[PDB]
Short mmCIF file of C-alpha atoms in Angstrom, two decimals:
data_model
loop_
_atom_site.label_atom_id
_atom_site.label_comp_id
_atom_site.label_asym_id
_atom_site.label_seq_id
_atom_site.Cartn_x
_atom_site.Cartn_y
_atom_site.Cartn_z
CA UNK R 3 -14.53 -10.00 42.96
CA UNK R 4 -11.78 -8.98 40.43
CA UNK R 5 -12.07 -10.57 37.13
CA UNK R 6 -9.16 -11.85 35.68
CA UNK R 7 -10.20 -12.42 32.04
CA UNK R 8 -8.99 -10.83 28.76
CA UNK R 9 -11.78 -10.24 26.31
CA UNK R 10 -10.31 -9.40 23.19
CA UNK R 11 -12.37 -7.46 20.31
CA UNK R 12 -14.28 -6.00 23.02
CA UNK R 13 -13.99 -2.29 24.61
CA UNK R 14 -12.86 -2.26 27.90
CA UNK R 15 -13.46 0.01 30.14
CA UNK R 16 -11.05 1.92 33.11
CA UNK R 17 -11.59 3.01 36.77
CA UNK R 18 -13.57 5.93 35.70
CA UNK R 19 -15.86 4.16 33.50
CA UNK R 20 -13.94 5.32 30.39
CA UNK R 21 -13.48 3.08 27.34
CA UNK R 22 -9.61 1.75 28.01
CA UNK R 23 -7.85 3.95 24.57
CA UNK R 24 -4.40 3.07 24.42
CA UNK R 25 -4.10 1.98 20.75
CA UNK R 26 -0.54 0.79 19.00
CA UNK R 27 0.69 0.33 22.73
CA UNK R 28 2.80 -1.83 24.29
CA UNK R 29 3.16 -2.63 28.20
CA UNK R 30 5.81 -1.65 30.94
CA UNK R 31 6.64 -3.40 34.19
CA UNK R 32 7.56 -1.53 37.65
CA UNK R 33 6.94 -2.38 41.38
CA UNK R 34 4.22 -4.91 40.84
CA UNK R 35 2.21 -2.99 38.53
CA UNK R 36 1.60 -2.84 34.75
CA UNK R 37 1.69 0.25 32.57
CA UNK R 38 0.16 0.20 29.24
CA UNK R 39 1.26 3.25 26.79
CA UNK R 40 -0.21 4.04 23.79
CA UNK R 41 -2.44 6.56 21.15
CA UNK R 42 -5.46 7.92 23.20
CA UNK R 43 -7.13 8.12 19.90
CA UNK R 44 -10.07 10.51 18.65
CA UNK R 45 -13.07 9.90 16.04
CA UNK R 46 -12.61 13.35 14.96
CA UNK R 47 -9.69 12.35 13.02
CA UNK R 48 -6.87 10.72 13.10
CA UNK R 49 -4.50 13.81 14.20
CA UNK R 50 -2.24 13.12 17.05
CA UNK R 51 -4.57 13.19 20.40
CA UNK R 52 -1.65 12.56 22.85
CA UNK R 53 -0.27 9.34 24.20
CA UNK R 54 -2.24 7.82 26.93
CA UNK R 55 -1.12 5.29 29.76
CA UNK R 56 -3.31 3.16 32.21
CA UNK R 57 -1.59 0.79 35.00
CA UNK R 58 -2.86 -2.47 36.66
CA UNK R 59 -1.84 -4.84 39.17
CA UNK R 60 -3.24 -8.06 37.12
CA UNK R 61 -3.25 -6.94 33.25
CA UNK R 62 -7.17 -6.91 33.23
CA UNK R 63 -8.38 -4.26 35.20
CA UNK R 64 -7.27 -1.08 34.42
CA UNK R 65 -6.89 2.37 35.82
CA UNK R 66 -5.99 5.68 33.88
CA UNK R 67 -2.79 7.15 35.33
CA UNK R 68 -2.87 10.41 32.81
CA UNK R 69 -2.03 11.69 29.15
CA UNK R 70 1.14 11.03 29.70
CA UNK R 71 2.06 13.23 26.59
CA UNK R 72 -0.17 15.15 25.04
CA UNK R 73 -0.86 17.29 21.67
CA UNK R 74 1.94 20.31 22.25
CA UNK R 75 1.69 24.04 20.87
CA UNK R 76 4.05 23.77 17.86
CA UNK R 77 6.70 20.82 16.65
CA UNK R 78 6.66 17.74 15.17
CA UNK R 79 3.91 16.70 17.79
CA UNK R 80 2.52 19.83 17.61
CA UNK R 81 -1.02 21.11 15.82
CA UNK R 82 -2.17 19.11 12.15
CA UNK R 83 0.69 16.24 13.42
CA UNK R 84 0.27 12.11 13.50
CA UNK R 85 1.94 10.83 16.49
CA UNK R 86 2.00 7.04 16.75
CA UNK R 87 3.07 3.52 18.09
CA UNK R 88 4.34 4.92 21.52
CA UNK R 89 6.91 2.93 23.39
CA UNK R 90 8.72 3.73 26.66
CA UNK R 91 12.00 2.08 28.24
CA UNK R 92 13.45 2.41 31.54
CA UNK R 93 16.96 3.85 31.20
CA UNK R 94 19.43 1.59 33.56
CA UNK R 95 22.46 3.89 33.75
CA UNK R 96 19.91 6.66 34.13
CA UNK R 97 16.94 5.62 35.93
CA UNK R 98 15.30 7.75 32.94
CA UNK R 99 11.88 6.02 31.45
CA UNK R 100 12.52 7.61 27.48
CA UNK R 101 9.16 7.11 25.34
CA UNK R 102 10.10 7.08 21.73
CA UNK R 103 7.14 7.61 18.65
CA UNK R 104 6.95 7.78 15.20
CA UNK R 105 5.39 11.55 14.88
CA UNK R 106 4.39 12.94 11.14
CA UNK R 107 2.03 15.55 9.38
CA UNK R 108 -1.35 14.19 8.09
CA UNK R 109 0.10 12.84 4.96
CA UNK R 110 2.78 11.08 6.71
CA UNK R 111 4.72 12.88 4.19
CA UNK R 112 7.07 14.30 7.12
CA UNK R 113 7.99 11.03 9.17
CA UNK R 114 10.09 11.79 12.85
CA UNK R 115 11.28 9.23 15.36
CA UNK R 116 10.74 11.40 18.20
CA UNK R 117 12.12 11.09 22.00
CA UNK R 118 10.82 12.33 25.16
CA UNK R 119 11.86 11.93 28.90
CA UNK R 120 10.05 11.61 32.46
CA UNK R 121 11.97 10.87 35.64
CA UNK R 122 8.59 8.91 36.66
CA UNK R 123 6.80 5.76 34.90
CA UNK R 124 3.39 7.52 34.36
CA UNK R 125 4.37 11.26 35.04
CA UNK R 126 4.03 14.34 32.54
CA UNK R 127 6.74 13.41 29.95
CA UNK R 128 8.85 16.27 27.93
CA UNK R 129 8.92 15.97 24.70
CA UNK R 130 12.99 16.60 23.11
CA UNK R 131 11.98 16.27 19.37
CA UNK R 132 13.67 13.90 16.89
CA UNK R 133 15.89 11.58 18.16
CA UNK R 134 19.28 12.24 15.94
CA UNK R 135 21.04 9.63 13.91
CA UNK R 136 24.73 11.13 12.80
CA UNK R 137 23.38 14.37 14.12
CA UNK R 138 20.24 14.06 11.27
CA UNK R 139 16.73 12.79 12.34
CA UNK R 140 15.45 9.31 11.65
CA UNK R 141 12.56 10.11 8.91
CA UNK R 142 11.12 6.76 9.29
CA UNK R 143 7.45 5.64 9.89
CA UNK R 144 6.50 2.73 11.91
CA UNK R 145 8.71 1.68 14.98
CA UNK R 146 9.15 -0.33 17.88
CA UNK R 147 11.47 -1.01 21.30
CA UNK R 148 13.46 -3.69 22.06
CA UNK R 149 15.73 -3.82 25.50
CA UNK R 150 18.25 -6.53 25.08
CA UNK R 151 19.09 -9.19 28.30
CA UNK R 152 22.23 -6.57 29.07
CA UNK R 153 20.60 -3.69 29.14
CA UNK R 154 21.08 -2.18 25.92
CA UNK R 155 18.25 -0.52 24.09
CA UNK R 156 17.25 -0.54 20.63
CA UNK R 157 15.27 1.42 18.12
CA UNK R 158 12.94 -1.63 15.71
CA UNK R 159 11.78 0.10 12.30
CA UNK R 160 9.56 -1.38 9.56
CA UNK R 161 11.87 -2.98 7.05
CA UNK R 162 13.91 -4.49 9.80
CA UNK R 163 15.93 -1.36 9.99
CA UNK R 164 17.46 -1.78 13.59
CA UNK R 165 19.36 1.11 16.07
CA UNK R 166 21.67 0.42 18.36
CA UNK R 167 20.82 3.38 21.43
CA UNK R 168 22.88 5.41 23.64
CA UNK R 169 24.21 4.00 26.54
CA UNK R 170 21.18 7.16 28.19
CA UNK R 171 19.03 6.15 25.73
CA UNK R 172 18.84 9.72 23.45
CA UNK R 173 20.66 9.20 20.90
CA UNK R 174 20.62 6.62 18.00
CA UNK R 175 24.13 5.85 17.80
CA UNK R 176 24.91 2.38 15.29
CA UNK R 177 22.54 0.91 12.94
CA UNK R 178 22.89 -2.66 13.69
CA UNK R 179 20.44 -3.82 10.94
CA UNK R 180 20.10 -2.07 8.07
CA UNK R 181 16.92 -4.27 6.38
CA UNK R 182 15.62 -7.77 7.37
CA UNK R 183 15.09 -9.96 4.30
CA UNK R 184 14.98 -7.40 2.07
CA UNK R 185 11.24 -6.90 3.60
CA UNK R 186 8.91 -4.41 3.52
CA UNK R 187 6.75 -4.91 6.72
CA UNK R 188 5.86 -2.87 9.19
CA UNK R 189 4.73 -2.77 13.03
CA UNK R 190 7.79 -4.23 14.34
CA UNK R 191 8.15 -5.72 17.48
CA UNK R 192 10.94 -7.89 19.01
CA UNK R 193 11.43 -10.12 21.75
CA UNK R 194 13.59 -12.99 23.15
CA UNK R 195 13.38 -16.46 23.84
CA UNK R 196 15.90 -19.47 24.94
CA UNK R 197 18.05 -17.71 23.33
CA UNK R 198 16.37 -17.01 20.07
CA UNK R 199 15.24 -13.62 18.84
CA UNK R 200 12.16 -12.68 17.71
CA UNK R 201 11.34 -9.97 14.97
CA UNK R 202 7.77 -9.33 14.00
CA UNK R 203 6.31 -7.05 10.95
CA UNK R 204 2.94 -6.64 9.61
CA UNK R 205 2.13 -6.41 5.78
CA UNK R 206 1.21 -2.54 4.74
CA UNK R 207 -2.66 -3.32 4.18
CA UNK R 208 -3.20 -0.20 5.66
CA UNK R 209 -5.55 -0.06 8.80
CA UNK R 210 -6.82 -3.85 7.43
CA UNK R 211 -5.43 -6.78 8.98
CA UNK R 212 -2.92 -9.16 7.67
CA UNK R 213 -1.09 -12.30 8.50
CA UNK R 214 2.01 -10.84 9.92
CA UNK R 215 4.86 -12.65 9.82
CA UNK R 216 8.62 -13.31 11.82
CA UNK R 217 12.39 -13.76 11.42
CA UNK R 218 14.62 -15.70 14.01
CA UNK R 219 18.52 -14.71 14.88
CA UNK R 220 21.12 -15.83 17.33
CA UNK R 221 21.58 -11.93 18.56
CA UNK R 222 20.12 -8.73 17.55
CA UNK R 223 22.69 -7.96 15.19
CA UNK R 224 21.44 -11.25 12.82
CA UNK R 225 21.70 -13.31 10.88
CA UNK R 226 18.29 -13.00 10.30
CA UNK R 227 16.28 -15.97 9.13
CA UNK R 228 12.79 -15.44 7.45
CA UNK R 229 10.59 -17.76 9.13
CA UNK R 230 6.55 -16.91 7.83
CA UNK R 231 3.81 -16.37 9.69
CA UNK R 232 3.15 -17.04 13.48
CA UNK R 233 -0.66 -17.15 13.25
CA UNK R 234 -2.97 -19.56 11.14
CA UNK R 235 -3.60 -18.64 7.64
CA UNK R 236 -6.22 -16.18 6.62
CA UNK R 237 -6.59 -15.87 10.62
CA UNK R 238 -5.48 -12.11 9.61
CA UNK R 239 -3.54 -12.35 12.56
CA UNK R 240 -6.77 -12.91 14.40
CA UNK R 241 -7.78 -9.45 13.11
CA UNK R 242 -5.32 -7.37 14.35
CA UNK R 243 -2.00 -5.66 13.79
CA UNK R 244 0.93 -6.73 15.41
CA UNK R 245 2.39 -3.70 18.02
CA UNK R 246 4.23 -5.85 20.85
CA UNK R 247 4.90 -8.27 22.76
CA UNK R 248 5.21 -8.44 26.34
CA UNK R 249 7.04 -11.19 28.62
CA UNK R 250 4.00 -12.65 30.80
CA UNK R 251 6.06 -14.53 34.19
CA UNK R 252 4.31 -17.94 35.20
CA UNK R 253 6.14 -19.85 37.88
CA UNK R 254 9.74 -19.95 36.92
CA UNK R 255 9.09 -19.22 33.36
CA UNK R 256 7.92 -16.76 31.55
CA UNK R 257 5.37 -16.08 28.35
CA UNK R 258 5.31 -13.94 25.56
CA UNK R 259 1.94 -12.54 25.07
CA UNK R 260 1.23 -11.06 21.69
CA UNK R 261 -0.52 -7.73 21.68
CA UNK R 262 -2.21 -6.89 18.63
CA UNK R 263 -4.75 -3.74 17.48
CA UNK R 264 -8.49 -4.56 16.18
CA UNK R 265 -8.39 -0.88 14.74
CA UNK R 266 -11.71 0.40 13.60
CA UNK R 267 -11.14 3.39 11.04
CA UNK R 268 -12.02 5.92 11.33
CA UNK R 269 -14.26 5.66 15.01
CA UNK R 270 -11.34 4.38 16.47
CA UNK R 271 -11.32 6.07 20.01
CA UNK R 272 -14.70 3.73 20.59
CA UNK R 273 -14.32 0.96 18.90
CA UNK R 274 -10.93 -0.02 18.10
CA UNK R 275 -10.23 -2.90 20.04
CA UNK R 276 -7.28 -5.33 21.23
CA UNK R 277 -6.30 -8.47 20.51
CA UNK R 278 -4.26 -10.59 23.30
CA UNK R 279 -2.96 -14.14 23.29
CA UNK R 280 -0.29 -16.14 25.04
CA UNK R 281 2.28 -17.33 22.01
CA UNK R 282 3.54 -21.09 21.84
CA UNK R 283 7.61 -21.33 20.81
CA UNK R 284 9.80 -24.57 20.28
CA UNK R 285 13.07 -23.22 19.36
CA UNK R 286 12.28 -20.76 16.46
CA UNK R 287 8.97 -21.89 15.66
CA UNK R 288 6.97 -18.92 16.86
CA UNK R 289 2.64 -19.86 16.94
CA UNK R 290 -0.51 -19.03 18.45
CA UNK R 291 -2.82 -21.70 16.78
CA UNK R 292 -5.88 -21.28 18.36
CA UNK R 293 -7.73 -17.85 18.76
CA UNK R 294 -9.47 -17.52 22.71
CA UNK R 295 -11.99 -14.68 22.41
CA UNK R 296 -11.71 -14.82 26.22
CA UNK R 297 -8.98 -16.18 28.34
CA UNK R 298 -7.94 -16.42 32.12
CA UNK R 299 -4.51 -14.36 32.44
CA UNK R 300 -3.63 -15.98 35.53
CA UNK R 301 -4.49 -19.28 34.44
CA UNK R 302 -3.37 -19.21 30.97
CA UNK R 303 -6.49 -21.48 29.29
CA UNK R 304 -9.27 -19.74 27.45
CA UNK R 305 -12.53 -19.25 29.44
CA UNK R 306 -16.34 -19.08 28.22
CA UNK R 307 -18.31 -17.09 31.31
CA UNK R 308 -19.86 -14.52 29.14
CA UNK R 309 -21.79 -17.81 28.17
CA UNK R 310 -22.80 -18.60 31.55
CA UNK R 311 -25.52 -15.82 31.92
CA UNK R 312 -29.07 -16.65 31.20
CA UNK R 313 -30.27 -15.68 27.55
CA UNK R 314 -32.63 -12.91 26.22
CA UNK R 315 -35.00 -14.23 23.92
CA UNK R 316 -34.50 -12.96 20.75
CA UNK R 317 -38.33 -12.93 19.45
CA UNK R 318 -39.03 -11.47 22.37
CA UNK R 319 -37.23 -7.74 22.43
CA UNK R 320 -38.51 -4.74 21.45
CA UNK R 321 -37.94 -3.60 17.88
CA UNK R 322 -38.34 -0.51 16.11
CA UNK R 323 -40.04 -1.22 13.35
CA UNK R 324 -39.42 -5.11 13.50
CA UNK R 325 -39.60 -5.54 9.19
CA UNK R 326 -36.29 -3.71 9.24
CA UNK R 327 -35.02 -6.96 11.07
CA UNK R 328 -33.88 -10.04 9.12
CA UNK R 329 -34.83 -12.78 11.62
CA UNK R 330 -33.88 -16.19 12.18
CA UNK R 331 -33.04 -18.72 14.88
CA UNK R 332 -30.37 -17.79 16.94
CA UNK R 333 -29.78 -14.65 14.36
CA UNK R 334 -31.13 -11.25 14.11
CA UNK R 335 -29.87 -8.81 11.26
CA UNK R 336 -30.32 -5.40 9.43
CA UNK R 337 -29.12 -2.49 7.54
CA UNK R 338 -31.80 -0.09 8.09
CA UNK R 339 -30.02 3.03 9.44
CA UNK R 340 -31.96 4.34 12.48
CA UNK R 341 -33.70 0.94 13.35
CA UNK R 342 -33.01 -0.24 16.97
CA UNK R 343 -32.86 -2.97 19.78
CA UNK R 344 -34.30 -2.05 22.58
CA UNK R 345 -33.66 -4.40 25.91
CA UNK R 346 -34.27 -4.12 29.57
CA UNK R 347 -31.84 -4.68 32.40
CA UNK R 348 -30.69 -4.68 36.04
CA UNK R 349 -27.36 -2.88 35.85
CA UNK R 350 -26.13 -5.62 35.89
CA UNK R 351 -23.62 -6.71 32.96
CA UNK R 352 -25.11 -7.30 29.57
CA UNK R 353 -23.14 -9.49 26.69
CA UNK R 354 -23.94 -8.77 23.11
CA UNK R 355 -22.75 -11.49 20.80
CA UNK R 356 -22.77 -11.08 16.92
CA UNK R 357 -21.25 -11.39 13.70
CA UNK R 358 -18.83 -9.64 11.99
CA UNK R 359 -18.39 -9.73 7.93
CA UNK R 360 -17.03 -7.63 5.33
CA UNK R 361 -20.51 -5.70 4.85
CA UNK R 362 -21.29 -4.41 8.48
CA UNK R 363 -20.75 -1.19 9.72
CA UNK R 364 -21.03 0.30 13.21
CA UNK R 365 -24.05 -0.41 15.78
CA UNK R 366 -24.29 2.71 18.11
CA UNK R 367 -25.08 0.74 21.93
CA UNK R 368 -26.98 3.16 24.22
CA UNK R 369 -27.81 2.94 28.14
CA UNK R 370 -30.96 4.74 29.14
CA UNK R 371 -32.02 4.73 32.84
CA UNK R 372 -35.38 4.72 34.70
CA UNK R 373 -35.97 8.31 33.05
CA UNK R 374 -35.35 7.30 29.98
CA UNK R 375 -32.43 9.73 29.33
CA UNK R 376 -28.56 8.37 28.11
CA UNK R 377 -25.96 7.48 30.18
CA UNK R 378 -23.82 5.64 28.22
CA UNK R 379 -23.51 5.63 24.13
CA UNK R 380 -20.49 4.24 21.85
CA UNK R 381 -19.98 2.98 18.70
CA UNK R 382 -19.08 -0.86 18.06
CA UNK R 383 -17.89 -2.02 14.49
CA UNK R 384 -19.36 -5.34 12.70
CA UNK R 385 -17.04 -4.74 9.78
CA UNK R 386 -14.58 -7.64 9.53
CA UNK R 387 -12.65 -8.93 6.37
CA UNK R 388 -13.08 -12.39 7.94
CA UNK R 389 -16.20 -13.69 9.53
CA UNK R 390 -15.95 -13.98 12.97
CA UNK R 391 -18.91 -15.12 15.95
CA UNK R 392 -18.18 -14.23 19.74
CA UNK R 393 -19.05 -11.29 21.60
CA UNK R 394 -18.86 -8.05 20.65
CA UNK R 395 -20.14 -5.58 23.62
CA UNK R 396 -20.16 -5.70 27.03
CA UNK R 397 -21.83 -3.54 29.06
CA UNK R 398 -20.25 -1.12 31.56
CA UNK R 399 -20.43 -1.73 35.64
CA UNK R 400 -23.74 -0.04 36.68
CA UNK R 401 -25.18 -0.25 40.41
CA UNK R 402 -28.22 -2.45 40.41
CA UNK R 403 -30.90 -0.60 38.68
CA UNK R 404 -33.56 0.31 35.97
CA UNK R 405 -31.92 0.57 33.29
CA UNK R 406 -32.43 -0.46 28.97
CA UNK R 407 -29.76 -1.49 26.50
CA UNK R 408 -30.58 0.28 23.04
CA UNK R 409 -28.32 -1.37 20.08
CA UNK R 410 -28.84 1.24 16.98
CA UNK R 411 -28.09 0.31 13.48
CA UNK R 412 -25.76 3.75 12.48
CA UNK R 413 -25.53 3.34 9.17
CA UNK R 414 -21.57 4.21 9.21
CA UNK R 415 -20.20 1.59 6.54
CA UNK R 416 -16.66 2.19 7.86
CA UNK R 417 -14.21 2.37 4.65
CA UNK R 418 -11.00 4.10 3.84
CA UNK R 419 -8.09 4.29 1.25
CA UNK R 420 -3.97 4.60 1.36
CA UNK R 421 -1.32 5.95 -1.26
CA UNK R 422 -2.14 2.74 -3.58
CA UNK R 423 -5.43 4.64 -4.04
CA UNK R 424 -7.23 0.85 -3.06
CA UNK R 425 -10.31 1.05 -1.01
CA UNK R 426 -10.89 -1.38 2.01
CA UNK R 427 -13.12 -1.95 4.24
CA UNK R 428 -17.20 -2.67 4.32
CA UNK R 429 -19.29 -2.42 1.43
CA UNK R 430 -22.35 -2.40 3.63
CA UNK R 431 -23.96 -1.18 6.93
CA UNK R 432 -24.98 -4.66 8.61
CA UNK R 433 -25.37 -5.34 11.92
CA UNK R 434 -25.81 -9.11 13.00
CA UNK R 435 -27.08 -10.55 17.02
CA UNK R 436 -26.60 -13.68 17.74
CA UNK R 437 -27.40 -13.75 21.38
CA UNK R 438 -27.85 -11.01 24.14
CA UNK R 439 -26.92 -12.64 27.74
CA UNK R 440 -27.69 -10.75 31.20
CA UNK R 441 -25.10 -11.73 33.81
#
């Protein structure tokens, strides 16, 4: 049976059993399949790791294809580099699939738009360095793709900065928008609809989430209208950061679904997760206005089966050292770095559900077998600005077996700081079960 739902905030996991890490991504059609591109990040640091892609014939499960480009031997992609926000296009004079990133040195004090080239969707790409603006680099930071109805190919860039591309897709010829609304967001993406174009930004809260916000225009050229935001208020964009949008096809019409990142600095290779959703527009009112923590992507309607396994008693699992535990009904909680969960299971899959607030930090979910020894172990973040309930984990495929879930309380109060010198993040290590259902 091949599931067909979309759990966002969760990890998901490939062919190979391997957490799905394609982070500031976007998605490209060919032949019936779906290829995902993005950062194939690393909790070492946040260095550039190479740019991953994974392909699928329903948008759910997923199968790693390759590092599609990864860390080179010198450059501006090259050793102590960033290289972000990866986006590929499909040439249609050339036949050429041209990936395009925003590449930088740790400071992302030395910002690149860089090009590279693959005659294949998902083969090993060559990197060509910057791509050249009146014979100069672009030394801009965050950027997007858009391919307009006639083919023509553009180059998005936070501020609304716009770049009209080569008819083979190299070269940055025109800049067709020099600013949007005299903003200062970031992220873009771009899309069309009935006519209307779409231009999304994020605010620069750093790797915290924001309620990003939109501008409408009659062509990609402008004028562009400011138009707020297109998720609820304080919804934080449901806790993620805009990074594209891709054109979902139902019957004779099509979809945009939002793609977001749920990135979890600095154990982001783990636990940074996605957030997914089909948008709602009327014209140029752009929405999603009501969050589905799962939904069917053939269907379109959210879904609840994580729900429809049969519940582990909570004052009945086995706790190390059980005063480290804050317990109530329906609610177990604690701070206590080193003090664990411990519960058995078939192989079968296992649902942790849980809250997140602004003082939790990471939980550390091990898989022992019959011997007792680890085959599984990744780190899951709590920390949210904005309280959310749903579920948080899910347990890998495992042949039916002997096996015990172990949820650890790390003690990893996940924080960080930009150029504004402000601090975000947790202020505290919690870690908060609600319910743990066996399917």
């Amino acid at each position: 049976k091949t599931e067909k739902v979309v759990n966002n905030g969760i990890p998901w996991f490939d062919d190979r059993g391997e957490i799905v890490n394609a982070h500031g991504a976007c998605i490209v059609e060919e032949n019936g399949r779906y290829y995902l591109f993005g950062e194939y990040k690393s909790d070492k640091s946040n260095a550039f790791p190479g740019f991953s892609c994974y392909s699928s014939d329903d948008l759910v499960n997923w199968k790693f294809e390759r590092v599609v480009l990864p860390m080179q031997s010198s450059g501006i992609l090259g050793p102590d580099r960033v290289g972000e926000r990866v986006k590929v296009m499909k040439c249609p004079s050339t036949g050429e699939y041209v990936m395009y990133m925003h590449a930088d040195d740790m400071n992302y004090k030395d910002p690149h738009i860089g090009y590279a080239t693959c005659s294949t969707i998902a083969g090993e790409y060559k990197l060509h360095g910057p791509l050249l603006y009146e014979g100069k680099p672009i030394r801009r930071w965050d950027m997007g793709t858009y391919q307009d109805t006639d083919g023509t190919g553009y180059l998005l860039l936070h501020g609304g900065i716009v770049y009209r591309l080569s008819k083979d897709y190299r070269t940055a010829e025109e800049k067709v928008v020099s600013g949007v609304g005299g903003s200062h967001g970031e992220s873009p993406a771009m899309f069309k609809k009935d006519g209307t174009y779409f231009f999304l930004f994020s605010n620069l809260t750093s790797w915290e989430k924001n309620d990003n916000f939109y501008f409408t225009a009659p062509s990609v050229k402008g004028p562009w209208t400011r138009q707020g935001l297109f998720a609820p208020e304080g919804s934080l964009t449901y806790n993620s950061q805009t990074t594209f949008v891709f054109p979902l096809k139902c019957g004779e019409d099509t979809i945009p679904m939002f793609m977001g990142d749920r990135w979890s600095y600095p154990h982001q290779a783990s636990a940074a997760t996605y957030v997914w959703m089909p948008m709602q527009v009327d014209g140029t009112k752009l929405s999603i206005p009501e969050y589905w923590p799962s939904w069917d992507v053939d269907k379109l309607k959210p879904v609840n089966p994580l729900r429809k396994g049969k519940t582990v008693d909570l004052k009945k699992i086995t706790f190390s050292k059980e005063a480290d535990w804050k317990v109530e009904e329906g609610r177990i909680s604690s701070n206590v770095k080193g003090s664990t969960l411990s519960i058995p299971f078939t192989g079968s899959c296992v649902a942790v559900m849980g809250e997140t607030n602004c003082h939790s930090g990471y939980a550390r979910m091990n898989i022992l077998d019959k011997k007792g020894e680890k085959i599984y172990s990744s780190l899951v973040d709590f920390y949210s600005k904005a309280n959310d309930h749903a579920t948080r984990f899910k347990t890998p495929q495992l042949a039916e077996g002997e096996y015990t879930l172990v949820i650890e309380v790390t003690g990893i109060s996940p924080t960080w700081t930009d150029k504004t010198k402000r601090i975000y993040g947790s202020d505290d290590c919690f870690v908060t079960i609600t319910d743990i259902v066996k399917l």
